[PDB]
């Protein structure tokens, strides 16, 4: 009754029989922008069911040596479905998200993933190693799209900050002996009421193994991690031609 | 009318509107049947019913 769950939005339904409750980021559900917080004057478009629905975007393989990955929002979805089209045809965008990370193994496998959402996840570089070069991360690294990107130095989250404190952010753990998914609801987080879905990623999703995957030889060795997410309360404004960058 | 109760459906929980010109009711038209249905008899004949929201095996 805390372990079983069904999430239905749009024409999509997710089920899980080994859940660990649901986290509502910063204790606040997503909502549409009020007339007093808004500034842009055109009437927005709110497509509803055709964009607020679950999209399964990618699968990674968890290996005994995996470092961890990240995805950026709304970047992961800007080229997918009717949501993508709207994000491309409109200058302004805003929405919340329901994130459902999936990973099942067996009662004989073990390991624990930390699944967290970090708003304004700015990536740093190793500065030429010596720390004397002011190098910058390239586009494919700051906005990896649906493929996500692998962390080079998980301990400092590729940004000079301790992953040990990442739990100060909305998160759940997928500890194999306990659950097989993480569900996080994130409201729209920004210092502006609407923004560009292309130029700005409001938050990053981090999936990092903290207790490494293990099992005895002979047990299924391919343990996938699949990412499914749904935009909530999407609004778009400032219509013109479609743009991808 | 004033016929015999010869029909194969005399005593059926559903009533019909038929036509007849003979003293025996089985001579009557098929008419119209009432539209009642009980699918649970076949689709859900469990002793202790379970709701849609719950987990069937608890």
């Amino acid at each position: 009754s805390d372990r079983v769950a069904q999430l239905t939005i749009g024409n999509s339904t997710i089920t899980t029989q080994e859940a660990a409750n649901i986290i509502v980021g910063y204790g606040e559900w997503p909502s549409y922008c009020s007339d007093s917080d808004a500034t842009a004057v055109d009437k927005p478009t709110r497509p509803d069911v055709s964009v607020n629905r679950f999209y399964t975007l990618d699968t990674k393989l968890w290996e005994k040596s995996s470092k961890g990955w990240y995805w950026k929002f709304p970047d992961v979805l800007t080229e997918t479905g009717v949501f993508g089209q709207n994000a491309q045809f409109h200058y302004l965008y805003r929405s919340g998200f329901c994130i459902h990370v999936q990973c099942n193994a067996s009662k004989f496998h073990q390991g624990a993933l930390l699944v967290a959402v970090l708003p304004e996840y700015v990536i740093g570089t190793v500065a030429g190693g010596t720390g004397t070069e002011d190098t910058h991360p390239p586009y494919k690294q700051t906005q990896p799209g649906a493929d996500g990107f692998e962390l080079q130095h998980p301990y400092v989250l590729d940004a000079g900050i301790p992953i040990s404190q990442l739990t100060v952010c909305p998160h759940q753990w997928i500890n194999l002996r306990t659950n097989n998914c993480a569900t996080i609801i994130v409201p729209y987080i920004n210092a502006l009421p609407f923004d560009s879905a292309l130029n700005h990623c409001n938050f990053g999703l981090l999936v990092v193994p903290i207790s490494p995957l293990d099992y005895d030889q002979g047990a299924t060795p391919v343990i996938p991690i699949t990412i499914t997410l749904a935009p909530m309360c999407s609004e778009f404004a400032g219509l013109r031609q479609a743009v991808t960058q | 009318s004033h016929e015999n109760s010869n029909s194969a459906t005399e005593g059926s929980t559903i009533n019909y509107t038929t036509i007849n010109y003979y003293k025996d009711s089985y001579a009557a038209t098929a008419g119209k049947q009432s539209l009642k249905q009980d699918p649970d008899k076949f689709a859900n004949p469990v002793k202790d019913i379970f709701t849609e929201m719950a987990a069937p095996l608890k």
């Binding site: 024409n11 | 194969a8 089985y26 539209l35 009642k36 249905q37 009980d38 859900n44």
Partner: protein, 297 residues
């Protein structure tokens, strides 16, 4: 009188059929109600346990976001009378001039509707059926020509004497019902009541009609239900001299005032014999069509 407690608190003799379900009116298809997103733990309509033996109780509204649809689609055409009260061929009788079969101007047909597949497959969807029937008799020559000939049809219930010639004394028909009709007249047509000694006819009878050893010689009686044996339909040309014309009588049956009980799987193999489910063991076919792989259409 009963003094011991166990006799007093006994349910021996309870004749009330306690029913777990009940019929509700349903003249149209069910409507669709508006539904929205649900992101909740504990509640899970999509998950089932087919082992229980029940069908899924999940509906459109709980699996996707639905709009409101007011459904006026009628359920009237799927009532048993709608399905069965349509006349189909159940018998064919030949009265030829020269021949091996019924060559003497008369024929006796034991009433059995299992000789034709369309009709037989529909009624066998159920185990027990109770109904009245309308029988229509279409007669003509083998080319479909209409000739000036008088016929006599007689219903011979079990125990009544079956005619053995076109001149049998049995045709006096003083008690049996007979229909005298010309081939030139429209098809003869009559209403027949539900006649079994049982409360219903049964297309399947898993047993024997009599007691005794069931030695292989008398295994042709396995599944033989006398309760479905309504008698003989006899026909003759009305004369002491042979008819000038070869004739064919087609028999159509239309059920009405139908009740049915116990649905069963529908026939998926060709029928071979009347009133018996034998199928060709060397040609067992899949119920439907096949394809080369489970991953392509």
């Amino acid at each position: 009188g009963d003094r011991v407690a166990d006799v007093i608190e006994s349910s021996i003799g309870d004749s009330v059929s306690r029913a777990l379900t009940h019929a509700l009116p349903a003249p149209t298809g069910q409507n669709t109600q508006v539904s929205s997103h649900r992101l909740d733990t504990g509640k899970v309509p999509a998950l089932q346990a087919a082992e229980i033996g029940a069908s899924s109780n999940a509906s459109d509204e709980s699996m996707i976001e639905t709009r409101c649809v007011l459904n006026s689609h009628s359920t009237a055409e799927t009532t048993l009378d709608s399905f069965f009260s349509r006349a189909g061929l159940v018998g064919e009788i030949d009265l030829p001039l020269k021949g091996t079969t019924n060559p003497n101007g008369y024929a006796n047909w034991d009433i059995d509707i299992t000789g034709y597949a369309q009709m037989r497959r529909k009624v066998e969807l159920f185990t027990y059926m109770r109904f009245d029937a309308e029988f229509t008799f279409v007669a003509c020559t083998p080319t479909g020509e209409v000739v000036p000939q008088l016929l006599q049809y007689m219903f011979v219930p079990p125990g009544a004497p079956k005619p053995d010639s076109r001149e049998s004394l049995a045709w006096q028909t003083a008690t049996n019902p007979s229909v005298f009709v010309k081939l030139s007249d429209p098809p003869a047509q009559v209403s027949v009541p539900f006649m079994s000694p049982a409360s219903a006819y049964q297309w399947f009878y898993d047993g024997y009609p009599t007691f005794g050893e069931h030695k292989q010689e008398k295994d042709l009686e396995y599944g033989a239900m006398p309760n479905n044996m309504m008698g003989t339909f006899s026909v003759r040309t009305v004369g002491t001299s042979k008819s000038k014309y070869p004739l064919v009588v087609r028999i159509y049956m239309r059920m009405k005032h139908v009740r049915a009980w116990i649905p069963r799987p529908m026939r998926n193999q060709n029928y071979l014999f009347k009133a018996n489910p034998n199928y060709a063991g060397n040609s067992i076919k899949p119920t439907g069509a096949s394809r080369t792989a489970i991953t392509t259409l």
